[PDB]
Amino acid sequence: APARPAHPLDPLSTAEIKAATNTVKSYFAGKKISFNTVTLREPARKAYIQWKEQGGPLPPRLAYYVILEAGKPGVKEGLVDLASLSVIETRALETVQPILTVEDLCSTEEVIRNDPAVIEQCVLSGIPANEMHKVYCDPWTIGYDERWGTGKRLQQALVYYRSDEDDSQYSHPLDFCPIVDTEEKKVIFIDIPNRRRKVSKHKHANFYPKHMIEKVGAMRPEAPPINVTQPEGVSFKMTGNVMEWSNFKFHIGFNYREGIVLSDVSYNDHGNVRPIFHRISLSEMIVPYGSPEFPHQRKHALDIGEYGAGYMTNPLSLGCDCKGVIHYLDAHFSDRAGDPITVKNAVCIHEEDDGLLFKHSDFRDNFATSLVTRATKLVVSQIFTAANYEYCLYWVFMQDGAIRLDIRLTGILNTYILGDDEEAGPWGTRVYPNVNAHNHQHLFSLRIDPRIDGDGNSAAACDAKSSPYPLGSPENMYGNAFYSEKTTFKTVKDSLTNYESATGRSWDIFNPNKVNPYSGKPPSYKLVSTQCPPLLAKEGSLVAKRAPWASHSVNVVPYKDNRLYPSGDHVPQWSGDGVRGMREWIGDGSENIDNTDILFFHTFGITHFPAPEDFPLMPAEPITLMLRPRHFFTENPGLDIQPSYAMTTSEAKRA
Amino acid sequence: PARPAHPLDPLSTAEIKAATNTVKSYFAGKKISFNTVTLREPARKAYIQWKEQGGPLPPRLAYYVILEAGKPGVKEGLVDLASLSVIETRALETVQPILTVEDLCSTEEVIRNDPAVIEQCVLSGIPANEMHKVYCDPWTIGYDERWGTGKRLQQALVYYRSDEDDSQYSHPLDFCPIVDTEEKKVIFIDIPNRRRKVSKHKHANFYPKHMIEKVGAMRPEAPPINVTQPEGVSFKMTGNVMEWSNFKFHIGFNYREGIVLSDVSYNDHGNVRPIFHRISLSEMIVPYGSPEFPHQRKHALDIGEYGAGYMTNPLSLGCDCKGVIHYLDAHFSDRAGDPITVKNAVCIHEEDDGLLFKHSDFRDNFATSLVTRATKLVVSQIFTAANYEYCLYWVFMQDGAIRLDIRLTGILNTYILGDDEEAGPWGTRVYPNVNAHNHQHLFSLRIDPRIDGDGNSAAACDAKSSPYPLGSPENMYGNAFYSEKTTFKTVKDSLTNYESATGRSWDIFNPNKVNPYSGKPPSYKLVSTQCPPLLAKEGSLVAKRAPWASHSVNVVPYKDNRLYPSGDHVPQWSGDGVRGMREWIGDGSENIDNTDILFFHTFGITHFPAPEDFPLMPAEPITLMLRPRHFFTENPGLDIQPSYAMTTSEAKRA
Ligand SMILES: NCc1ccccc1
Ligand SMILES: NCc1ccccc1
Ligand SMILES: [Cu+2]
Ligand SMILES: [Cu+2]
C-alpha cells in the first residue's frame, strides 16, 4: 500500500517502515514485541540485473524485520511484502542476540546508577553514594562471555567518572565492570579485580576551549580562512539516489548496519556503459584489544554487526564536517516502538580539488611545450560514533576510473584505570596519570560484489618476482629481470591469502571472458592495499573464531543471495563456534570461484599502540585502499578532460 | 660578496659569479667548463654552535666541479667566497659527473648529423632527409663495461615524430647510439639481431586537438572550484625561514636534491624543540626489468645523474599550484660559469586537509560535539626527467607530523615491439608496436635527526602476539599482543626491510630523555609501507650502483659531507669499490646508539605498465610519514579553535 520508490535499491521510506511495523504488529497481535531492525531486504542479484538490463520482472519491495518478544529468549526475524502488507516469512531464533540500537545503549547508565551493588562499588572506589549522577558508562555488548552464552541479552558497563558534566570522562575509568541484562534492566553481576584501584584524584584531561585556556593559557588566534566556492554549481548530477559524475554512474544506498552501500557501479566509456561493481560496502569490523587480563578479553568490538555504522552515524551538517557545496542524504530507521526515525544529513556528497591528474613538459624547448590537467574527486562520506571512537568514512571516485576508500580514525582512546605503582606495558600505554590505554587493532571487512565489464569474474594474487634465472645466465645476464606472477584462484581455498611486503602483493578482480586489444590481458580492477595487519589474536582464540574473515587479507567465495555479513546475521554473544558467516561460505574450500559470480572480502586496517599524542582526544589517523582499472581501458581515460594549461611545440615556436 | 642572512641559504647569482671568476683565474690559461657550482653547507657542529652557542658565523663556501678540455674525468673543489680564493682542489680522473641541461641538449644534433645514425634511420624506414623527424632522450650510458669511465658517454634512446607536436613515445626506434659527450661524436651503435622498423600506426597523442580527432570532442569545461584566502595566509617567511603552526625550518634548494629542509623545530608552548637537522631526497634508482641487451642500462639514478634541481619545472605557468602561493627561484651555473635562474622552482602554500579531530557524546544525540579542521603546509617542486614527471610535496601537519607525498606522472619509457612480438613477461604492449618495460622507482630519503636535542638512536618496531599460547594463565584467551622494539646498536643491526607480517615501523628517538606520562623516549615514528624489495639480484649492476636500495632502512654515523649514498659522481661508476653507503656501512660494527646518526630510508613502487598509463599517465601516489610518538604529553593541536564546539552544559541551555 505504500508508494514504491523511484529505484529498487532505494532504502525504505518512513512510510514503508511504518507500513512494515503495522503489518508485523498485527501478525503478532496480543504479544508484547519491540523492533530491533526494520530495513530493506534487497532484491536478489539475478532479479535486479534482469530488471535493470533485460526488461525483466519488477522485484518485490521487501522489508526485513527483527523483533524481540518480552519473556521469550532470543529474537524473531522475518520479511514483510510491502505491496500486499503481509508477513511472508518468519522464524524464531531463540539462541542469538541482535544488534544493539541507540535505545539499548541509553538505558544502561540509569540501570547501573540505581543498582545497590554498583553504588557500593562506587563507594569503595572513592565516590560517595549521593554522587551516582557523576558515574557514567559506555554500555558495550558483553561481546562474549562463556558464563552466559546467548542465554540472556547482556551488556558490560565500562564505568567512568566526571567531576563536571562537561568533563571528558576517559581520564577517569573505574576498576570494575557491571554486567547488565539488557531486557530485564538489571545488573546481574559485577567483575571486580583482585587489586582494587580507587578513582583517580588528578584533574580530568579536558579539550574544549575553556579547558585549554586553563591548561595552556590561551587558544591560538583564529587562522585566516580558506574559502571554497563553486559559483557555477557542481559537476555531478543526482536523480534521487542515483549519482552521475565524470562518467561514473551508481546508486548510493544506506542501512542501519553497513552505513553507505554503493550499488550498480558503471563507467561510461565514450558511449559504451561498462559495469564495474554490483555492490560495494563495509560488511563488518573487529577491534580486538591486546591485554590478556580479565575481563579485557571481552573488548573486541565488531562495531558494524553489534551496533551499526548506520545506527551510530552522525548528522553531518551542524559540525562543519563537510566543507563546500554539499548534497546531503537522510537515513531512516525504525525505533523500538516501530516508528520511523530520521537522521538528517547522514551522508554528505561533494566534489573537491585533488591536485594534479597528469602533467608532461618537453625539455627540448625548456618546458614551453607542456600540458597540465587538474584532478577533481567525488566524495561520498559518513561519520559514525562508537561510544569513545569516531570513524570517518569517505568513498572516493577519481578521474582515472579509480575508486578509493579513505578512513580517518579519531575520537578518544578506550581507557581502563592504572594504579600509581602499576606498569601498563607491554599491553598498553600510560597516556595520562592513572590512565591505561590498551593496545588494539582496528580491522574492517570490505565486501565487493564485482561485475568487471560484465558477468563472469575471477580473482588472482599478483606478486612481483625476480626472474628464476640466475645472474650471468643467458636469460638474465645482468640480474635485473623481473615480472608479475599472477596466481588465479580456482577454488575458495586458493583465495585465502595475505598481503605480502616481500612481493608488493596486489589482487586483481578481472573478467576472463574478455581481452584488452592492446595488452592482451583481461580487463580488471586491481586492489592496491598495504594497510593489512595480520590478526594478532591466536588461532582458536575468541577473536579469531568470532571474525573468521579477519584472519586473511582476502577471502573470495561464490555469490549467493544474502551473503552480506561475514560474522553471521546476529553477532552479539556468538561464541564463534558453528558453520555460519564466512566459515559457512568458505565451507570445505573446494567450490569453484574461477569465471563465476563471486564475492571478495578484504580485511584491512591498523594496529594501534597508543601514545600521549592520542589523548585526551586523538588526531585523525588515516587508512586507505584503492581499486584501479588495469587493462580495463585501452588508454588513459581522463585525456578528454580540458587541461588547465596546454601549449604544443608549434604554438611555443610561434610565441 | 655580501654574506646572506642565513648560512644555509643557497648561493646567490652574485655568489655563483664570484665563484666561477675565482675558479677561472686560479686555472688561468686553461679551457675549463662548469658542471656544478653550489653551496658547501657548513659542518653540522659549526652550524649548531652559531645557532645556539654564540659560535662564529660559518664561512660562506662554494663547491665546484669542472671539466678541462683534453683532460679525463673532472676537477672539484671549494672556493672561499669572502677572500675570492680556491681553498681546496683535486682532480678525479676516473669518474664522470652529473649531466647538465646543456650536455643533454646537444646530443640530438649530434645524432641527427651522424652518418652511421643516419644509415640506421634509413634501414629503419626513415629517409635521410627526414632526420629533423628523429628525436632522442639523451640518458647517461649509466654503466657499460665496454668503456667504464674512460670516456664521458650518453646513450641516445631514439624516437620518431610525424609532426613536431606528436608525443614521440608511440614510435621508438630499435637501435641505440652511444655518444661521446665531450667530443660530440657517436662512437658506437647497439643494433639488435632482429631489426624492427618504425611503426606505421598513428602517433598516440594527448593534446585537445588530437583528442577531438580521436574521440569526437573534449568534455565540457567543468564548473570551477575556487580557493580564496581574503585575509592572506597563516604562514610567515623571513628569507628562506618558514614559520607555521609552531614549526620552524629553513627551506633550501640545490641542483641535485632539489628541496632541502633544515633546522626543523617545533615550538611546544614556548619550549623550542629540535626535530631534524636536515631532511631531503638523496638519490633514486629506476631499475628496468627486461634482461635483453641493451636494456640493463636502463636504471637511472635520477638525482645523482641529472639532478632534481637541474631538472625542475617553473611552476605557475602550468596551473600546478592552486591557491595563494609563495614561490622560490633556483640559481645554478651554466657551462660558461654564468648564473642561470629557474623562476618559481619551489612552491609554498597552505591547504585544507579534512578533519584534524572530532568527538561527540552519544548521550544527548551528538549535541555535545567538538570538531576541528586540519590545515596542511605544502612545500613542493616538480621535475622532468625526459619522459617522466616527479611531483614532490613536503607536507607539515598540525598534529606535528611531517609527510612526504610524491606523484608520478608524465610518459612511460617505451621501446619498439614487433607485430608478432610478445612483450610479456618483461613489459606490456600498451599500444601497437609499443613495449613498456617493467620497472621500479626507488628513492633514498635522507634524515639527519635531532629528536628533542643531540644524541639519538633508531629502532625497529614490530607488532607481535604474546609468546604465551592460547589457554595459559598469561594469555587465557589468546589475544595479548605487544610491540617489540629492537634498538639498533651497530650499523649492521639497522639494515632492515619493511615487514608486513609485523607491520613494521621504525623509531628515531632520543634515549637521553623520557616522556613524563608514558615513560618512553621522545620519538618521530617513520610510518611507511611503499617499501618494495629491490628486485635486481645480489651482485647485479643495479644492486651494486645502489647499495642503499637493498634495504628499506640503513643507519650510519653522522660525518659531514655524507650526502649521496651512491657516491659523489654517479654516472658510469661500475658499483665496485668502497664509496657512498658501502663506505659508510664499512664492516657494520660502528656504534649508532645515542650518537650523531644518519637515517637513509628506501621506498617507492614497482610499475607493471598498463594501457591506462599510455600515452600520458594518471598520477600514481607514493607517501611516507613521520609522526611524533611520546614526543608530546598530549595532542598538540588542542589549542587550535574548533570549527564547531558545544558542551553538554551548553546543549542543555539551547
Ligand atoms: N566499540 C564498542 C561500543 C560501541 C558503541 C557503544 C558502546 C560500545
Ligand atoms: N631518467 C633518465 C633520464 C633523465 C633525464 C634526462 C634523460 C633521461
Ligand atoms: Cu585505535
Ligand atoms: Cu613507472
Side-chain angles (χ1 to χ4, degrees), chain B residues 104 137-139 300 302 306 311 384-388:
Chain B
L104 296 188
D137 294 331
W139 292 46
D302 286 314
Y306 311 94
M311 280 183 299
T384 298
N387 57 302
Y388 322 88

Side-chain angles (χ1 to χ4, degrees), chain A residues 516-523 629-637 639, chain B residues 412 428-431 434 436 607-618:
Chain A
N516 185 287
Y518 292 175
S519 73
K521 299 315 186 180
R630 303 301 283 167
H631 313 270
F632 189 85
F633 305 104
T634 58
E635 86 170 353
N636 176 345
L639 293 173
Chain B
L412 289 179
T428 306
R429 187 169 178 269
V430 300
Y431 191 72
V434 176
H607 193 162
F608 293 104
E612 281 78 8
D613 295 332
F614 198 66
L616 165 52
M617 59 172 330

Side-chain angles (χ1 to χ4, degrees), chain A residues 290-301:
Chain A
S291 161
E293 303 176 15
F294 200 93
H296 308 309
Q297 86 281 174
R298 301 198 308 249
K299 311 185 288 198
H300 53 273

Side-chain angles (χ1 to χ4, degrees), chain A residues 105 138-140 301 303 307 312 386-387 389:
Chain A
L105 318 195
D138 283 347
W140 287 41
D303 275 317
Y307 314 85
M312 287 180 295
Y389 320 87

Side-chain angles (χ1 to χ4, degrees), chain B residues 2 4-23:
Chain B
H6 191 115
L8 308 178
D9 281 357
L11 287 183
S12 74
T13 59
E15 284 173 312
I16 296 167
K17 195 61 200 172
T20 57
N21 296 336
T22 302
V23 176

